[PDB]
Amino acid sequence: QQSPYSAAMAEQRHQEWLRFVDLLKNAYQNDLHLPLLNLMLTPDEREALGTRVRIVEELLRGEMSQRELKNELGAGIATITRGSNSLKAAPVELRQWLEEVLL
Amino acid sequence: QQSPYSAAMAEQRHQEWLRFVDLLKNAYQNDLHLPLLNLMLTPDEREALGTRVRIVEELLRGEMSQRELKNELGAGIATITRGSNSLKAAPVELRQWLEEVLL
């Protein structure tokens, strides 16, 4: 399956990663996370994260917005179809009265 | 002092950075930070952070350990000096009795 080494390295990676998460967790409940993050990340890496959060918002707002559009269209067409069927179901009296308020 | 642009870019950088900190803050009080961090950072960047936390521990344990050493030495010498002076202050009776338990 896997070497005795690669497995120890995999395990170490995981522990070290967990430890970072916990370090940052704790720093939060202490108001030290701004200092810690300055220690853990260069200025360019922080900018990069700041940039990535903005990218995520743009991707999300983009998709949200395409979705609201596709749903508007969907609903606009469904309403025409549904209007059509309901028109066929209307009683003659309603149909003629409607026809008559048209003419 | 500074261009109207560079100032707007400086301000944007700062806001985006603050927003990341808050995003990660909130994800913590929600148990989503493992997912978010996976979204915000590649596998190589996480390894890198895991590595950096380990480097910080090694640098700290290193310095701690040099400090305990310098303090041990310090204290070892201060004790000899202090033993010396106290020996000069001892009463003859104590000095001779000590001398006598030596011989």
Curated annotation (Swiss-Prot), chains A, B:
Localization terms from the record: Cytoplasm
Gene3D superfamilies: TrpR-like (1.10.1270.10)
Known function: This protein is an aporepressor. When complexed with L-tryptophan it binds the operator region of the trp operon (5'-ACTAGT-'3') and prevents the initiation of transcription. The complex also regulates trp repressor biosynthesis by binding to its regulatory region.
Name recorded for this polypeptide: Trp operon repressor
Top-rank taxon, per record: Bacteria
DNA-binding region(s) from the entry: 66-89
Gene: trpR
UniProt xrefs under InterPro entries: Trp_repress, Trp_repress_bac, Trp_repressor/repl_initiator, TrpR-like_sf
Lineage: Bacteria, Pseudomonadati, Pseudomonadota, Gammaproteobacteria, Enterobacterales
Family: Belongs to the TrpR family.
GO molecular function: DNA binding; DNA-binding transcription factor activity; sequence-specific DNA binding
Transmembrane segments: none
Main localization (coarse): cytoplasm
GO cellular component, one term: cytoplasm
One of the GO BP terms on file: regulation of DNA-templated transcription
